Amino acid sequence: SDLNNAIQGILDDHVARGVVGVSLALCLPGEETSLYQSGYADKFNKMPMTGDHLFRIASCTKSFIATGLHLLVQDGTVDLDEPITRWFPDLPKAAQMPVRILLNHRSGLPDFETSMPMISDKSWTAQEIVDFSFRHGVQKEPWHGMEYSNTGYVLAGMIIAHETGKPYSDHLRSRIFAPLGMKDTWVGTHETFPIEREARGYMHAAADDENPQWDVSGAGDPVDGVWDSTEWFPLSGANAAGDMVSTPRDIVKFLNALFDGRILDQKRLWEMKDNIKPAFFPGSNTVANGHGLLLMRYGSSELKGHLGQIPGHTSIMGRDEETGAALMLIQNSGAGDFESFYLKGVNEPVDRVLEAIKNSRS
């Protein structure tokens, strides 16, 4: 179709901007998921990008951890409004923290991501990340305002583990991945994944990487304007804040089924997507968030989903509610600065695709 050719052109023009490669999955209403890739999975081997190339989905992981949590609310074991002291009695200010503030980025919890070395071979415990957060981060009061929290999702994961007796990966697999047919999806912290199948991740030495968001010391020297950051960071360091590996095809499987009532009941879905407050993420299109989903505005279209940044892989997923379209676009180009073209610029092809969808619908 004309749409098919318009979309492949958007991806081609984006990789021509300097982006190593991009993988997209797009489901439109009354249609099968159609996949589009451009550029390379492996810059130096010139391997073409396919729809079978795995990516680290980074904070997109967060939409699954919320779902898993919401599933345990349906199970009757967890209450969104009850204090987390039940699970974390010694956590400062815990009594002011209902289960929902873990998910909604209003908890005031101190964060770990900006202090955590991105290059290491160190494995992390959930608790180890939490002690790290309080040691290096800044704690604000609950409900102070919106400030993106990874720590809240790490704590969310620990609730899941305690309530189900097994690692949070077991719950997400048995309740989400398995019944949906998601066969190319792993939870990094607790599961091994086929490294050989992953698209390589590229950090660009770019002029606009003026204010790196990560401690990337130990990177060594670049080669042909990039570092291969694929295996820089152990996923156990991100934990429930961003440890999942997947394909855009598998993610669209999840999204269609979530927005289609087939995972979460109508009340848990409403919490996730409709019970919202204003939200900010530096260099993104985020305007609001629920309890697991960021609302990201692209001109006259909006996606409910998530952004993901982990060194070298850069992802945007969501559903457009006005049009029914689901999409996961991931590039294997990244940088550190939020405002870098290599991070913030992933939003441009996403915008253009939603414009092409809209125009083909008129």
Ligand X SMILES: *C(=O)[C@H](N)Cc1ccccc1
| Least gap, CB of 336 to ligand X (angstroms) | 11
The option from Ba ion, ligand X, none interacting with 137 (CB < 5 to 8 A, set by class) reads none
**Which residues are at the interface with ligand X (CB under 6 A)?**
58-59, 113, 116, 150, 237-238, 241-242, 308-310
Contact 298, 53 (CB under 8 A): no
C-beta closer to Ba ion: residue 3 or 35: 3
The option from Ba ion, ligand X, none interacting with 98 (CB < 5 to 8 A, set by class) reads none
C-beta closer to ligand X: residue 78 or 310: 310
C-beta closer to ligand X: residue 88 or 153: 153
* Helix, strand, coil share (%) of the chain residues, nearest 5: 35, 20, 45
| Contact positions with Ba ion (CB under 5 A) in 298-337 | 300
Query: What is the secondary structure of 133-172 as a DSSP string?
Result: HHHHS----TTSS----SHHHHHHHHHHHHHHSS-HHHHH
Return d(Cα 234, Cα 142) in angstroms, integer. 30
The option from ligand X, Ba ion, none interacting with 121 (CB < 5 to 8 A, set by class) reads Ba ion
| Least gap, CB of 165 to ligand X (angstroms) | 25
C-beta closer to ligand X: residue 111 or 320: 111
Q: Report the chain's terminal Cα–Cα distance, integer Å.
A: 15
The option from Ba ion, ligand X, none interacting with 362 (CB < 5 to 8 A, set by class) reads Ba ion
The option from Ba ion, ligand X, none interacting with 241 (CB < 5 to 8 A, set by class) reads ligand X
Return d(Cα 341, Cα 331) in angstroms, integer. 12
Phi, psi of 187 (to 5 degrees): -100, 110
C-beta closer to ligand X: residue 96 or 120: 120
Return d(Cα 171, Cα 160) in angstroms, integer. 8
Task: Tell me the Ramachandran region of residue 262: left when phi exceeds 0, alpha when psi lies from -120 to 50, beta otherwise.
Answer: alpha
Burial (CB count within 10 angstroms: exposed 0-12, middle 13-18, buried 19+), residue 140: middle
Is 2 a residue that touches Ba ion (CB under 5 A)? no
Other CB atoms within 10 Å distance of the CB of residue 15: 19
C-beta closer to ligand X: residue 112 or 259: 112
Token couple for 193: 């994944």
Which segments of 286-346 does DSSP mark as H helices, in order? 341-344
Total residues binding Ba ion (CB under 5 A):
4
Is 362 a residue that touches Ba ion (CB under 5 A)? yes
The option from Ba ion, ligand X, none interacting with 189 (CB < 5 to 8 A, set by class) reads none
Return d(Cα 253, Cα 218) in angstroms, integer. 37
Return d(Cα 296, Cα 318) in angstroms, integer. 9
| Least gap, CB of 323 to ligand X (angstroms) | 25
| Least gap, CB of 140 to ligand X (angstroms) | 19
**Which one of 32, 81, 121, 224 is in contact with Ba ion (CB under 5 A)?**
121
C-beta closer to Ba ion: residue 46 or 300: 300
The option from Ba ion, ligand X, none interacting with 357 (CB < 5 to 8 A, set by class) reads none
Is 81 a residue that touches Ba ion (CB under 5 A)? no
Provide the binding-site residues for Ba ion, judged by CB under 5 A. 121, 300, 359, 362
